[PDB]
Structures are given as C-alpha cells and as structure tokens.
Design a binder for this molecule. Structure first.
Ligand SMILES: CSC[C@H]1O[C@@H](n2cnc3c(N)ncnc32)[C@H](O)[C@@H]1O
Length: 211
C-alpha cells in the first residue's frame, strides 16, 4: 500500500507540497525534539547546504502525509563529511565518487515509531541505490546506529576513529549496498518493492559524474 517515494530534480514538480512538509517535519524532529540547535531556522524549515538541485529525498508517504524519510547527496560535491566532519574520516579518507552517496536526515514521525516503517526505510536506501547502481552510501552517525545497521544486515566499514560531536559519540562509515542485504529485507518487510519512482527517470550516477 504505502510506499517510499524517490524525489529528485527530475520529478520534484510532482512533490513540491510534500517537500515543504518534510522540511517543516525535519525542523520539528531534528531541531525541536533532538535539540540539534545548529540547524534551527526562523522560517521553521530545516534546510542546510546539502538541500540543493542534486539532493535525492526518499520520503515515506501515506497519501500525501510524510511519515518518515531520509536523503542522499552526491559525494562528488562538497559533502557534510568533507566540509563539516572530515576529522571523522581521517583514517580511510572522505568518500568522493559518483558511486558513493552521502546518507543523512533519517527520521520517523512519532505516530509511526516502533512499527513497520523503520525496516521499510532501511530497505528503501538499499533498493534505490541498487536500482541506480550506487555501490555504497556514506554516513556520519551516532554510535548507537551500529547495532541498528547490523540488525538490518547492513555491511558497515568505519572510516575513522569515533569522536564526541557535541556530547554524543559519533563516527563516519560507509555502508555496502548489497542485493543480498536487500533480498533479506524484502522478505522481512513482506514486500517485493518499497521504492516508488513517479515522473521522469532519474540517472543519479550520471548526475553525480556531472558534479
Ligand atoms: C550527523 S550527526 C548529528 C550532528 O551533526 C550536526 N549536523 C547535521 N547536519 C549538519 C550541517 N549541515 N552542518 C553542520 N552540522 C550538522 C547536528 O547538529 C548534530 O550535532
């Protein structure tokens, strides 16, 4: 029934309503709930330097209500890791590759927490990337994400030493996109497909190469 929608420059004309709704939800969740104060904005829209023409949003929709989601950004452009947290990837280096996209802003609205949505969101990043031929995603994450990744069968490669970011233990890592990982998650969520791609086809790897 309800699906995760892939929204990009090529199809956002079908989702302008939904995108604005998600920017406000990101403000409710990341700013007002999680107290990530560096992201507070007076328009009540949580929008940073990595929300631009090249961002891809994977948003969980129930009708037109956004109930969860995350975003992907090409590492061929300056990224959150390269610009804000390069010290977290000092051992292995910050990713920079059309085949590696930076994954951030994972959220689930309160009404949908501790339910089916979470594992669908995990499946969605794997499904979208495999479809696009993206090999890895990169992430800056709090260390409590590690068992969550492992629980979803995500293959994780740390890029550097964990460090305190504000008052929270944080690390940089890549996640390997795997058909095998996805197949198990499809079985677990009980759906052959979780990602809906309406409007024109997106060629993410090509776009990243242009950057
Ligand atoms: C990504 S781990 C969470 C931490 O990263 C910070 N963060 C997330 N996005 C950005 C950004 N675009 N610029 C600076 N800090 C960020 C948040 O304020 C939080 O402290």
């Amino acid at each position: 029934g309800h699906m995760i929608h892939a929204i990009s420059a090529v199809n956002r004309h079908l989702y302008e309503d939904v995108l604005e709704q998600h920017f406000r939800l990101r403000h409710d969740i990341f700013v007002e709930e999680r107290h990530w104060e560096t992201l507070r904005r007076p328009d009540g829209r949580e929008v940073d330097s990595y929300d631009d023409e090249d961002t891809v949003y994977l948003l969980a929709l129930e009708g037109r209500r956004v109930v969860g989601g995350h975003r992907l950004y090409p590492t061929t452009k300056p990224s959150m890791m390269s610009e804000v947290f390069p010290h977290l990837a000092a051992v292995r280096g910050c990713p920079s590759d059309p085949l590696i996209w930076e994954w951030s802003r994972y959220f689930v609205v309160r009404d949908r927490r501790d339910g089916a949505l979470n594992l669908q969101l995990m499946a969605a990043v794997q499904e979208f990337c495999l479809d696009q031929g993206i090999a890895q995603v990169s992430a800056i994450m709090e260390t409590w994400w590690l068992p969550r990744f492992h629980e979803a069968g995500f293959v994780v490669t740390p890029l550097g030493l964990p460090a305190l970011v504000e008052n929270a233990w944080t690390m940089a890592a890549t996640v390997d996109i795997r058909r095998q990982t996805l197949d198990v998650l499809h079985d677990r969520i009980g759906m052959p497909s979780i990602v809906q791609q309406d409007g024109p086809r997106l060629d993410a790897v090509a776009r990243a190469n242009l950057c």
